[PDB]
Amino acid sequence: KVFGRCELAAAMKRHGLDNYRGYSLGNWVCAAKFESNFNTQATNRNTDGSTDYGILQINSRWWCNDGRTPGSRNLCNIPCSALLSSDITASVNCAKKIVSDGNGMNAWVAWRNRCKGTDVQAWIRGCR
């Protein structure tokens, strides 16, 4: 599923991501835009052999199990394919753990390079 911008904002808010760990809703929408372009099915392989899954590009070395990643820890206790669902619940629950791990939203490289320090409120402008 490719979410609309305000559609994803409403879903992230209903799931408790707005202001979670101090990160306003626009930070999360901006992160999803640049990690997956709002596409729940997005997958991308990394040079270390891991793969990133879903709307928030959650990694198979630390967070989810994909069965093909050396040194996998599966800290979210979830198959990586579950993070590709049209229902974002599993991605939100895992992202809440990632953002609590010590580095905040710096865990998302696209957030650090394309959202951090910008006017993130623009990503929720116009939404009701």
Curated annotation (Swiss-Prot):
**Catalytic residues identified in the record:** 35, 52
Q: Name one GO cellular component term.
A: cytoplasm
- Matches recorded under CDD domains: LYZ_C
- Disulphide connectivity of cysteines: 6-127, 30-115, 64-80, 76-94
What tissues express this gene product?
In the egg white and polymorphonuclear leukocytes.
Where found in the cell?
Answer: Secreted
Q: Which GO terms describe its molecular function?
A: beta-N-acetylglucosaminidase activity; identical protein binding; lysozyme activity
Catalyses: Hydrolysis of (1->4)-beta-linkages between N-acetylmuramic acid and N-acetyl-D-glucosamine residues in a peptidoglycan and between N-acetyl-D-glucosamine residues in chitodextrins
Q: Which residues form the C-type lysozyme domain?
A: 1-128
Q: Which InterPro entries match?
A: Glyco_hydro_22, Glyco_hydro_22_CS, Glyco_hydro_22_lys, Lysozyme-like_dom_sf
The UniProt annotation places substrate binding at 101
- Check the record and name the Pfam families matching this protein: Lys
Instruction: Fetch the PANTHER family from UniProt.
Output: LYSOZYME C (PTHR11407:SF28)
Say which family it is in.
Belongs to the glycosyl hydrolase 22 family.
Q: What is the name of the protein in this document?
A: Lysozyme C
Please name the gene that encodes this protein: LYZ
